[PDB]
């Protein structure tokens, strides 16, 4: 298992514009297009991202391409963030993937906001961090996915994904 596979399971793949769990326009493997309510604004963002007049539908290769970019962006944002970087640096490979997943879903800012949990992860207090991470809107809104990510942090294995 690896980050790409992990995220492909968490996000699925849609080749036609769709609305995510929060109601925002998305496409592909979890690629958020816009938070505006306008399908047109979404279509425009899509075209601009893809580089062609898409009519709201893309190919598998187009999706995979956005996906590669988005994962690269996530890691680079972690590495550029003063709060996230030290955490990431401290973790083993599997857990690093768990952190990228959270950033991928919620954004660097969002994750940087889990101050207390981050500190716990940094300290390697797995069980405590898992409980702290559970007390969040994130967990409450997307419990199954959150559970998978949280188990990954707790255990340091891919069990939740197999
Ligand atoms: Cl983009
Ligand atoms: Cl979920």
Ligand 1 centroid to 32 CA: how many Å?
9
Which residue, chain included where needed, has tokens 């809107």?
A: 137
Length of the chain as a residue count: 162
- Give the sign of the dihedral formed by CA 146, CA 88, CA 28, CA 17: positive
User: Which ligand does the CA of 138 lie closest to?
Assistant: 2
Ligand 1 centroid to 46 CA: how many Å?
8
Q: Is residue 114 part of an annotated ligand binding site? A: no
Measured distance CA(155)–CA(15) in Å, rounded: 34
Residue 135 sits at φ, ψ, to 5 deg, of: -85, 70
Ligand 2 centroid to 141 CA: how many Å?
7
Domain count, the chain: 1
Q: How far is CA 47 from the centre of its chain?
A: 22
Determined by X-ray
Q: Is residue 67 part of an annotated ligand binding site? A: no
Declared resolution, Å: 1.7
Which domain range does residue 6 map to?
1-162
Measured distance CA(147)–CA(42) in Å, rounded: 30
User: Which ligand does the CA of 21 lie closest to?
Assistant: 2
Q: Is residue 90 part of an annotated ligand binding site? A: no
Please give the radius of gyration of the chain, using alpha carbons only, rounded to the nearest integer: 16
Burial of 102 by CB count in 10 Å (0-12 exposed, 13-18 middle, 19+ buried)? buried
Q: Assign residue 40 the CATH number of its domain.
A: 1.10.530.40
Measured distance CA(16)–CA(135) in Å, rounded: 34
Measured distance CA(110)–CA(122) in Å, rounded: 17
């Amino acid at each position: 298992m690896n980050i790409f596979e992990m995220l492909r399971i968490d996000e699925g793949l849609r080749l036609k514009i769709y609305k995510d769990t929060e109601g925002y326009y998305t496409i592909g493997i979890g690629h958020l297009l816009t938070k505006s309510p306008s399908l047109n604004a979404a279509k425009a963002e899509l075209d601009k991202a893809i580089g062609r007049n898409t009519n709201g539908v893309i190919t598998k290769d187009e999706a995979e391409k956005l996906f590669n970019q988005d994962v690269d962006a996530a890691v680079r944002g972690i590495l550029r963030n003063a709060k996230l970087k030290p955490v990431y640096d401290s973790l083993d490979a599997v857990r690093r993937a768990a952190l990228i997943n959270m950033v991928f879903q919620m954004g660097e800012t969002g994750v940087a906001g889990f101050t207390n949990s981050l500190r716990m992860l940094q300290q390697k207090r797995w069980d405590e961090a898992a409980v702290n991470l559970a007390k969040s809107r994130w967990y409450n809104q997307t419990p199954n996915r959150a559970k998978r990510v949280i188990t990954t942090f707790r255990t340091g294995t891919w069990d939740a994904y197999k």
